[PDB]
Design an enzyme around this catalytic site. Structure first.
Site, PDB file in Angstrom:
ATOM      1  CG  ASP B  45      37.524  42.414  44.044  1.00  0.00           C
ATOM      2  OD1 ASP B  45      37.573  42.187  45.352  1.00  0.00           O
ATOM      3  OD2 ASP B  45      38.377  42.459  43.351  1.00  0.00           O
ATOM      4  N   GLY B  46      33.255  40.829  43.072  1.00  0.00           N
ATOM      5  CA  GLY B  46      31.779  40.942  43.008  1.00  0.00           C
ATOM      6  C   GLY B  46      30.898  40.569  44.356  1.00  0.00           C
TER       7      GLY B  46
HETATM    8  N1  UTR Z   1      35.542  46.356  30.603  1.00  0.00           N
HETATM    9  C1  UTR Z   1      36.045  46.387  32.046  1.00  0.00           C
HETATM   10  N2  UTR Z   1      37.180  46.120  32.242  1.00  0.00           N
HETATM   11  C2  UTR Z   1      37.720  45.983  33.439  1.00  0.00           C
HETATM   12  N3  UTR Z   1      36.663  45.818  34.422  1.00  0.00           N
HETATM   13  C3  UTR Z   1      35.505  46.292  33.986  1.00  0.00           C
HETATM   14  C4  UTR Z   1      34.922  46.356  32.618  1.00  0.00           C
HETATM   15  N4  UTR Z   1      33.947  46.450  32.757  1.00  0.00           N
HETATM   16  C5  UTR Z   1      33.579  46.440  33.908  1.00  0.00           C
HETATM   17  N5  UTR Z   1      34.417  46.122  34.966  1.00  0.00           N
HETATM   18  C6  UTR Z   1      34.349  46.180  36.264  1.00  0.00           C
HETATM   19  O1  UTR Z   1      33.189  45.099  36.564  1.00  0.00           O
HETATM   20  C7  UTR Z   1      33.311  45.154  37.645  1.00  0.00           C
HETATM   21  C8  UTR Z   1      32.232  44.204  38.465  1.00  0.00           C
HETATM   22  O2  UTR Z   1      32.843  43.045  38.947  1.00  0.00           O
HETATM   23  C9  UTR Z   1      33.348  42.982  40.342  1.00  0.00           C
HETATM   24  C10 UTR Z   1      34.547  43.389  40.421  1.00  0.00           C
HETATM   25  C11 UTR Z   1      35.188  44.034  40.765  1.00  0.00           C
HETATM   26  C12 UTR Z   1      36.380  44.563  40.635  1.00  0.00           C
HETATM   27  N6  UTR Z   1      36.779  45.547  41.253  1.00  0.00           N
HETATM   28  C13 UTR Z   1      38.003  45.696  41.522  1.00  0.00           C
HETATM   29  C14 UTR Z   1      38.623  46.797  41.758  1.00  0.00           C
HETATM   30  N7  UTR Z   1      38.219  47.774  42.681  1.00  0.00           N
HETATM   31  N8  UTR Z   1      39.885  46.796  41.570  1.00  0.00           N
HETATM   32  C15 UTR Z   1      40.408  45.790  40.942  1.00  0.00           C
HETATM   33  N9  UTR Z   1      39.584  44.896  40.319  1.00  0.00           N
HETATM   34  C16 UTR Z   1      38.367  44.972  40.681  1.00  0.00           C
HETATM   35  N10 UTR Z   1      37.491  43.973  40.214  1.00  0.00           N
HETATM   36  C17 UTR Z   1      37.831  42.913  39.417  1.00  0.00           C
HETATM   37  O3  UTR Z   1      37.172  43.073  38.523  1.00  0.00           O
HETATM   38  C18 UTR Z   1      36.976  41.842  37.589  1.00  0.00           C
HETATM   39  C19 UTR Z   1      35.551  41.933  37.395  1.00  0.00           C
HETATM   40  N11 UTR Z   1      35.060  42.154  36.287  1.00  0.00           N
HETATM   41  C20 UTR Z   1      35.237  41.691  35.200  1.00  0.00           C
HETATM   42  O4  UTR Z   1      35.728  40.567  34.984  1.00  0.00           O
HETATM   43  C21 UTR Z   1      34.657  42.308  34.016  1.00  0.00           C
HETATM   44  C22 UTR Z   1      35.448  42.730  33.133  1.00  0.00           C
HETATM   45  C23 UTR Z   1      35.120  43.373  31.937  1.00  0.00           C
HETATM   46  C24 UTR Z   1      33.807  43.336  31.742  1.00  0.00           C
HETATM   47  C25 UTR Z   1      32.902  42.817  32.606  1.00  0.00           C
HETATM   48  C26 UTR Z   1      33.132  42.259  33.679  1.00  0.00           C
HETATM   49  C27 UTR Z   1      32.323  41.659  34.798  1.00  0.00           C
HETATM   50  O5  UTR Z   1      32.489  40.807  35.194  1.00  0.00           O
HETATM   51  O6  UTR Z   1      31.186  42.572  34.814  1.00  0.00           O
HETATM   52  C28 UTR Z   1      37.194  40.945  38.806  1.00  0.00           C
HETATM   53  O7  UTR Z   1      38.550  40.354  38.540  1.00  0.00           O
HETATM   54  C29 UTR Z   1      37.360  41.650  39.909  1.00  0.00           C
HETATM   55  O8  UTR Z   1      38.203  41.140  40.873  1.00  0.00           O
HETATM   56  C30 UTR Z   1      32.696  46.523  37.576  1.00  0.00           C
HETATM   57  O9  UTR Z   1      32.677  47.307  38.912  1.00  0.00           O
HETATM   58  C31 UTR Z   1      33.800  47.051  36.892  1.00  0.00           C
HETATM   59  O10 UTR Z   1      34.552  48.009  37.324  1.00  0.00           O
END
Ligand code: UTR
Ligand code: UTR
Ligand code: UTR
Ligand code: UTR
EC number: 2.7.1.23
Lengths: 254, 254, 254, 254
Positions: B45-46
């Site tokens: 997704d990133g």
């Molecule tokens: N505290 C939070 N808890 C949950 N999410 C958070 C968040 N803080 C930001 N985010 C998110 O991070 C995204 C950036 O990354 C790509 C993406 C995506 C992404 N879109 C989606 C989506 N539409 N629906 C479902 N899953 C998604 N994903 C899944 O998100 C996971 C990626 N993220 C992280 O693991 C992560 C978790 C915590 C902290 C940092 C990160 C990070 O990596 O920065 C991957 O599994 C992707 O498949 C930002 O857009 C924030 O939405």
């Protein structure tokens, strides 16, 4: 116009109703509780809820007005005379409604706030099917499907999101779902657009406590409970601006 | 058609990209990363998020396709050849986007998942103004405004509701709001329709950490942050049915 | 006795401090901010927090008194003279504290409210180890370990439970944990008794933003963060009954 | 020793019970379901719950052992023979219990998981009194008072914190409390130490649905419901280390 007034039943509401009827007698206003074009509710949100269901078969020909002596009652009692003059000489705003269909003959209900399902004693277990697709098996205390205007009610206490009534949608929230190694639910609230059908189908126990706004009936030998945004809408008579978010602010913030 | 492929960067994605380019060479397909009509993202997704922002100025002329080696990547790597043949000879589905406007010259950003605001060190304090109406004063860790497709991301972890992408709306959730005798916030998530403008206005500290999807920049001397549903939409190329709720089921349920 | 008074710094607190010192001069009271036996804090909870850390190396020989001009400040300004007479001629109640140990030389901190860990930019990822047992891998915004008296502070906004200060325990709450097909955390808050050690161990990024009450420092090259109930306790001077649950009621209910 | 075995009732549990009895016949073990010193439960947590209440009047003279064919059942069926030999030739760990007192003659109940109160139809309204101090007026769906070992059960689904069973305490959680301009509750879960008495007192409706673990009875003409940590404890026979947090990890994490 043809109008009618319902009352909460206490002294303050009964007498405000009689005084508004008197003021209406000084205009071309005709009291009629069979085919009214204006339904005025005096009391609380529960009183307004009863007025809506009293005339739910003529919704497309009625404009509702609420007076709180509230969310659906957005008029102060001291403004009754101005409301009489305003009504005598307005714009209509419409809110979406929820259609509940219970199959066993089929029974259909219309909701302004929400419709909830709980067990008839014991654990509440249903399969949640979204557009003929099995989404989850819910095991817990119950489920709640709310209209937009109902999101500030039961839906809010269950952790649901508050959404503007201009969005034609419905929101499903959980009631104490169990989640461990064997049971799994989404947990988050779900917001569904129009034409999406949410079907709750029993697993073993077929008796459920089904609520529609303030009414709650035990339903026996249930085969399916279908939720969908109704094509019918409730119509409000609006004389002044009172945005939904301001009504939310005044009720919960300050 | 004019197409381009972006890669996650690892061995599996780089080589799947080279093989798809080779298969495209057997059709009337022209590789062009300047004016592509199809943007294929290979990774997570990133990775898809980076492809969207790489071409966010030509969104109305591009159809995105995602391959996960994911939510926006709804194609398995082993189905790449079928995707090549399918693409050579489709329907477009559109998701809403979030417009973020930062005033100090004005700066505007487009979001596919969400935009969040946090403090530059210390407490995060902003006044929340909905359509020129002061709704609350937020004091806490931050706020998050999510698109419909973004509700399963950051919005979900913050307790927000999951809503179908066909709903043109945005959802605002809180990050650890303080609530006592002096501080009060709504607590519940808020869902806003189109043309509703949510303005965050500083109180004392004017420096904020502002994020748009995966990017996070420190913004100095901020006067206003405006959130609204964008008139621009992202377009997906769809070859088979894969409902949003099934994608939700596969990602969180089973 | 040897006493000292700290002030919030505004006009109301500075002058209430000078008047209490004058009243103390009419008794066998000796002002000493090096070896005080009574520490009086005049201001808010943040002011009391600074007084506790100012004398955290002589906690077992000091009784704290709070005056709010608050949770730790349970004395009204108009009751200052009665507090002077009461103090001149009391019972001591003790609250548990949290010990934080950061390994890289080892650094130890003492907390009255809580200690939190957040990322130095980017995702916050740590392995949570409870008594040398790997319990979970946390990926999100941060974690918060609160004392009993701190449960009404940051812990409360994060969804933590409020627990009576007579319970020698610590409570760990999450900050926006991601939970999907690959990431999984307990979600619920965890309450640990004495001698239980909670170790947070980095995975890739080793820089973390570590807070202890009102202080927040960036820690570089972190190898471990250990949380445990401290053997040290803070001592309050109590002249009248003011139960913790009543203090909770007055601060959040009415 | 004097022992007894209870069975879930299915084929797998009934036959494992008969085989363990046979193995016990090869030692100085005497089957007695009137004055047993060891109570072995074979089935699930609900089966163990029934065994506890079957012998709740001789708790101080009985050691419980659980076999899941679970939280209270921490023995695999294939380890039954080792459990026979181990038992023939152990250490006792004790968990706190909850005392529920219902006044109208007075009725007292003992709980291993929790005790909950709900309405007999309509809104559930009680005044919450903590140590003769009015803390709040609760209006909603119900309340739940959990033991430490019960925090991973109903308490967890209601948002309660998980606490180690070595803490002699009880935790109170809410069930869908209404919170607006007129109704206000703490919202957060509350953890009470020993000798703290939580009294629920009716306002108008006096009929309540009162549960104690798996039992649920309608109680008429209720005047008071008192909750306190019981002086009685349940005793487990432990042959190997199986920490509570590891049992939590295996049940909810992986
Ligand atoms: N505290 C939070 N808890 C949950 N999410 C958070 C968040 N803080 C930001 N985010 C998110 O991070 C995204 C950036 O990354 C790509 C993406 C995506 C992404 N879109 C989606 C989506 N539409 N629906 C479902 N899953 C998604 N994903 C899944 O998100 C996971 C990626 N993220 C992280 O693991 C992560 C978790 C915590 C902290 C940092 C990160 C990070 O990596 O920065 C991957 O599994 C992707 O498949 C930002 O857009 C924030 O939405
Ligand atoms: N556990 C729950 N927590 C929160 N609400 C719950 C709920 N269980 C049902 N409901 C609700 O009850 C409604 C029936 O009553 C009229 C109304 C209304 C009503 N509409 C709204 C609305 N659109 N937006 C904001 N407030 C509303 N109100 C306000 O709701 C309060 C009325 N309710 C109760 O006090 C109540 C609370 C708990 C339990 C029972 C009752 C009860 O009385 O039955 C009054 O202040 C109204 O002004 C049902 O439609 C469920 O939505
Ligand atoms: N996101 C969060 N939400 C809730 N609290 C948070 C928090 N982030 C940190 N904290 C907290 O900040 C504290 C430092 O300040 C002194 C104190 C105290 C304090 N102790 C307590 C207490 N035992 N019980 C009840 N209230 C307390 N207070 C009350 O806390 C308010 C002070 N705080 C803020 O307003 C604040 C809020 C958000 C963000 C930053 C601040 C800030 O100022 O830093 C005042 O009303 C105090 O009376 C840290 O110890 C974190 O516990
Ligand atoms: N809405 C709720 N959500 C979560 N739990 C709820 C609850 N309503 C009551 N309960 C609970 O039901 C228990 C009675 O059952 C035996 C047990 C046990 C039990 N103890 C524990 C425990 N200490 N720790 C962890 N898991 C436990 N379990 C596991 O609980 C599941 C059993 N329950 C249900 O499935 C269930 C779920 C929903 C509704 C009804 C039932 C039901 O069956 O009555 C099984 O997996 C057990 O292994 C009552 O004591 C309430 O705690």
């Amino acid at each position: 116009m043809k109008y009618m007034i319902t009352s909460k039943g206490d002294e303050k509401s009964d007498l405000l109703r009689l005084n508004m009827i008197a003021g209406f007698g000084e205009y071309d206003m005709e009291y009629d509780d069979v085919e009214p074009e204006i339904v005025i509710s005096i009391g609380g949100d529960g009183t307004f809820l009863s007025a809506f269901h009293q005339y739910e078969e003529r919704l497309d020909e009625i404009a509702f007005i609420g007076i709180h002596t509230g969310f659906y009652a957005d008029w102060r009692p001291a403004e009754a005379d101005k409301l009489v003059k305003l009504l005598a000489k307005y714009q209509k705003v419409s809110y979406p409604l929820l259609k509940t269909t219970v199959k066993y003959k089929e029974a259909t209900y219309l909701a302004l706030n929400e419709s909830t399902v709980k067990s008839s004693g014991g654990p509440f277990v249903v399969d949640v099917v979204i557009n003929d697709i099995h989404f989850e098996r819910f095991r817990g205390d119950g489920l709640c499907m709310s209209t937009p205007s109902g999101t500030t009610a039961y839906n809010k206490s269950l952790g649901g999101a508050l959404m503007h009534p201009s969005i034609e949608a419905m929101q499903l929230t959980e009631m104490a779902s169990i989640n461990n190694r064997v049971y799994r639910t989404i947990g988050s609230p779900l917001v569904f657009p129009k034409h999406h059908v949410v079907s709750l189908q029993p697993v073993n126990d077929k008796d459920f406590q089904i609520s529609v706004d303030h009414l709650s009936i035990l339903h026996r030998d249930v085969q399916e409970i279908r939720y969908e945004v109704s094509a019918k809408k409730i119509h409000f008579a609006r004389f002044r601006s009172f945005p939904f978010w301001r009504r939310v602010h005044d009720s919960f913030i300050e």
